[PDB]
Coordinates of C-alpha atoms and ligand atoms in Angstrom, one line a residue:
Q3 CA 20.0 -2.2 0.1
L4 CA 17.6 0.6 1.1
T5 CA 17.9 4.0 -0.5
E6 CA 17.1 7.5 0.8
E7 CA 14.3 7.4 -1.8
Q8 CA 12.7 4.2 -0.7
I9 CA 12.9 5.5 2.8
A10 CA 11.2 8.8 1.7
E11 CA 8.5 6.9 -0.2
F12 CA 8.0 4.9 3.0
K13 CA 7.6 8.1 5.0
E14 CA 5.0 9.3 2.6
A15 CA 2.9 6.1 2.7
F16 CA 3.2 6.3 6.5
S17 CA 1.5 9.6 6.2
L18 CA -1.4 8.0 4.4
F19 CA -2.1 5.9 7.6
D20 CA -1.3 8.5 10.2
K21 CA -4.0 11.0 9.4
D22 CA -3.9 13.1 12.5
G23 CA -0.2 13.5 11.8
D24 CA 0.9 12.5 15.3
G25 CA 3.6 10.1 14.2
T26 CA 1.7 6.9 15.3
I27 CA -0.7 4.7 13.5
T28 CA -3.7 3.5 15.4
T29 CA -6.3 0.7 14.8
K30 CA -8.8 3.4 14.0
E31 CA -6.5 4.9 11.4
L32 CA -5.7 1.5 10.0
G33 CA -9.4 0.7 9.8
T34 CA -10.3 3.8 7.8
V35 CA -7.5 3.0 5.3
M36 CA -8.6 -0.6 5.1
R37 CA -12.2 0.5 4.4
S38 CA -11.1 3.1 1.8
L39 CA -9.5 0.0 0.1
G40 CA -12.7 -2.0 0.1
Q41 CA -11.6 -4.1 3.0
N42 CA -13.7 -4.7 6.1
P43 CA -11.6 -6.0 9.1
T44 CA -13.1 -6.1 12.6
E45 CA -11.6 -4.4 15.5
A46 CA -10.1 -7.7 16.5
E47 CA -8.4 -8.1 13.1
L48 CA -7.4 -4.5 13.0
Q49 CA -5.9 -5.2 16.5
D50 CA -4.1 -8.3 15.1
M51 CA -2.7 -6.5 12.1
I52 CA -1.1 -3.8 14.4
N53 CA 0.1 -6.2 17.1
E54 CA 2.0 -8.2 14.6
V55 CA 4.0 -5.2 13.6
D56 CA 4.0 -3.5 17.0
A57 CA 7.7 -4.3 17.8
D58 CA 7.7 -2.3 21.0
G59 CA 4.3 -3.4 22.3
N60 CA 3.3 0.3 22.7
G61 CA 0.0 -0.4 21.1
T62 CA 0.5 1.8 18.0
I63 CA 2.8 1.8 15.0
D64 CA 5.6 4.4 14.8
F65 CA 7.6 4.9 11.6
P66 CA 10.5 2.7 12.6
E67 CA 8.0 -0.2 13.1
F68 CA 6.4 0.7 9.7
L69 CA 9.7 0.9 7.8
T70 CA 10.8 -2.4 9.3
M71 CA 7.6 -4.2 8.2
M72 CA 7.2 -2.3 4.9
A73 CA 10.8 -3.1 3.9
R74 CA 10.5 -6.7 5.1
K75 CA 11.2 -9.2 2.3
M76 CA 7.9 -10.4 0.9
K77 CA 8.7 -14.0 -0.2
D78 CA 7.1 -15.5 -3.3
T79 CA 5.8 -18.4 -1.2
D80 CA 3.9 -15.9 0.9
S81 CA 0.1 -15.8 0.8
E82 CA -0.4 -14.8 -2.8
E83 CA -4.2 -14.4 -2.1
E84 CA -3.1 -11.2 -0.3
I85 CA -1.3 -9.7 -3.3
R86 CA -4.2 -10.8 -5.4
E87 CA -6.6 -9.0 -3.0
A88 CA -4.3 -6.0 -3.3
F89 CA -4.3 -6.0 -7.1
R90 CA -8.1 -6.1 -7.2
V91 CA -8.4 -2.8 -5.4
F92 CA -6.5 -1.0 -8.2
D93 CA -7.9 -2.9 -11.2
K94 CA -11.4 -1.7 -10.5
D95 CA -12.7 -2.6 -14.0
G96 CA -11.3 -6.1 -13.5
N97 CA -9.7 -6.2 -16.9
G98 CA -6.3 -7.3 -15.7
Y99 CA -4.5 -4.0 -16.1
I100 CA -4.0 -1.1 -13.6
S101 CA -4.2 2.2 -15.4
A102 CA -3.1 5.6 -14.0
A103 CA -6.8 6.3 -13.7
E104 CA -7.3 3.3 -11.5
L105 CA -4.2 4.3 -9.5
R106 CA -5.4 7.9 -9.3
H107 CA -8.9 6.8 -8.2
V108 CA -7.4 4.8 -5.3
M109 CA -5.2 7.7 -4.3
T110 CA -8.2 10.1 -4.3
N111 CA -10.0 7.6 -2.1
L112 CA -7.0 7.5 0.2
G113 CA -7.4 11.3 0.8
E114 CA -4.4 11.7 -1.5
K115 CA -4.0 14.2 -4.3
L116 CA -1.3 13.7 -7.0
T117 CA -0.3 15.5 -10.1
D118 CA -0.8 13.7 -13.4
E119 CA 3.0 13.2 -13.5
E120 CA 3.3 11.9 -10.0
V121 CA 0.9 9.1 -11.0
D122 CA 2.6 8.5 -14.4
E123 CA 6.0 8.1 -12.9
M124 CA 4.4 5.7 -10.5
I125 CA 3.0 3.5 -13.3
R126 CA 6.3 3.6 -15.2
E127 CA 8.4 2.4 -12.3
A128 CA 6.0 -0.6 -12.0
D129 CA 5.7 -1.2 -15.8
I130 CA 8.1 -3.9 -17.0
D131 CA 6.9 -4.5 -20.6
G132 CA 6.3 -0.8 -21.4
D133 CA 2.6 -1.0 -22.4
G134 CA 1.9 1.9 -20.0
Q135 CA -0.2 -0.3 -17.6
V136 CA 0.5 -2.6 -14.8
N137 CA -0.6 -6.3 -15.0
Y138 CA -0.7 -9.0 -12.4
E139 CA 2.8 -10.4 -13.0
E140 CA 4.2 -6.9 -13.0
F141 CA 2.2 -6.1 -9.8
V142 CA 3.4 -9.2 -8.2
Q143 CA 7.1 -8.4 -8.7
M144 CA 7.0 -4.9 -7.2
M145 CA 4.9 -6.1 -4.3
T146 CA 7.3 -8.9 -3.4
Ligands
DPD1 C1 0.8 7.2 -3.1 C2 2.3 7.0 -2.5 C3 2.3 6.1 -1.3 C4 3.4 5.0 -1.5 O1 3.1 3.9 -0.6 C5 3.8 2.7 -0.7 C6 5.1 2.7 -1.2 C7 5.9 1.5 -1.3 C8 5.3 0.2 -0.9 C9 6.1 -1.1 -1.0 C10 5.9 -2.0 0.2 N1 5.8 -1.8 -2.3 C11 6.8 -1.8 -3.4 C12 7.1 -0.4 -4.0 C13 5.9 0.2 -4.7 N2 5.5 1.6 -4.2 C14 4.8 2.5 -5.2 C15 4.0 1.8 -6.2 C16 2.5 2.4 -6.5 C17 1.8 1.6 -7.6 C18 0.8 0.7 -7.3 C19 0.1 0.0 -8.3 C20 0.4 0.3 -9.6 C21 1.4 1.2 -10.0 C22 2.1 1.9 -8.9 C23 1.7 2.4 -5.2 C24 0.7 3.4 -5.0 C25 0.0 3.4 -3.8 C26 0.1 2.4 -2.8 C27 1.1 1.4 -3.0 C28 1.9 1.4 -4.2 C29 4.0 0.2 -0.5 C30 3.2 1.4 -0.4 O2 1.9 1.2 0.1 C31 1.3 2.1 1.0 C32 -0.1 2.5 0.6 C33 -1.2 1.6 1.3 C34 -2.6 2.1 1.1
DPD2 C1 -6.6 -4.5 -0.3 C2 -5.6 -5.0 0.7 C3 -4.4 -4.0 0.8 C4 -3.0 -4.7 1.1 O1 -1.9 -4.0 0.5 C5 -0.6 -4.4 0.7 C6 -0.3 -5.6 1.3 C7 1.0 -6.1 1.6 C8 2.1 -5.2 1.2 C9 3.5 -5.7 1.4 C10 4.4 -5.2 0.3 N1 3.9 -5.2 2.8 C11 4.5 -6.2 3.7 C12 3.6 -7.3 4.2 C13 2.7 -6.9 5.3 N2 1.6 -6.0 4.9 C14 0.5 -5.7 5.9 C15 0.8 -4.5 6.8 C16 -0.4 -3.5 7.0 C17 -0.2 -2.5 8.1 C18 0.0 -1.2 7.9 C19 0.2 -0.3 9.0 C20 0.1 -0.7 10.3 C21 -0.1 -2.1 10.5 C22 -0.3 -3.0 9.5 C23 -0.8 -2.8 5.7 C24 -2.1 -2.5 5.4 C25 -2.4 -1.8 4.2 C26 -1.4 -1.5 3.3 C27 -0.1 -1.8 3.6 C28 0.2 -2.4 4.7 C29 1.8 -4.0 0.6 C30 0.5 -3.6 0.4 O2 0.4 -2.3 -0.2 C31 0.2 -2.2 -1.6 C32 -1.3 -2.4 -2.0 C33 -2.3 -1.5 -1.3 C34 -2.1 0.0 -1.7
CA3 CA1 -2.0 8.9 14.1
CA4 CA1 4.8 0.5 18.4
CA5 CA1 -8.1 -2.1 -15.1
CA6 CA1 2.8 -3.3 -18.1

């Protein structure tokens, strides 16, 4: 079910959160990412987001806890308003299509730097109709 690739892409994203590179994600680290993505949770909410995934109650999120949750099956009945919120961070022009630019812009804001190709390969794996962009329906499928 899970491939060494998905696992490796999950270790990368983990690194987006764990900025001090100590192998654990904190509420402070979660908050800064949330904000980079135009979200503004409170300490309490940050604390709630981390507790829900904190399988070992240690207070922070290690990779194993991250993989678990990240790989967890996102039902289609789930709160769609969340996926929607997620789509809006990318589609910054609100036109209904995520372009590599929009993807790039987000990465940059996440402290991430990618080659033009890294991003392109990213869009393509998301693209279903081949128009070179990612729409909502397409976004939904890969997110769930
Ligand atoms: C930039 C590489 C990091 C990959 O991270 C992730 C990898 C896989 C996932 C899982 C749960 N979703 C399904 C697989 C899609 N992964 C790559 C798709 C890509 C992407 C998103 C939108 C349009 C085209 C491509 C992407 C980039 C950055 C953040 C999330 C997604 C989430 C990630 O989100 C973490 C980022 C939170 C701010
Ligand atoms: C603007 C709101 C961002 C929510 O993003 C996402 C929301 C849900 C998912 C799905 C596929 N993951 C499983 C459902 C639980 N997600 C909440 C976990 C949370 C989280 C991460 C680390 C530690 C504790 C909690 C999170 C926040 C931001 C980005 C990814 C994950 C992926 C996202 O990543 C792709 C879009 C952002 C790059
Ligand atoms: Ca950390
Ligand atoms: Ca933990
Ligand atoms: Ca757009
Ligand atoms: Ca498309």
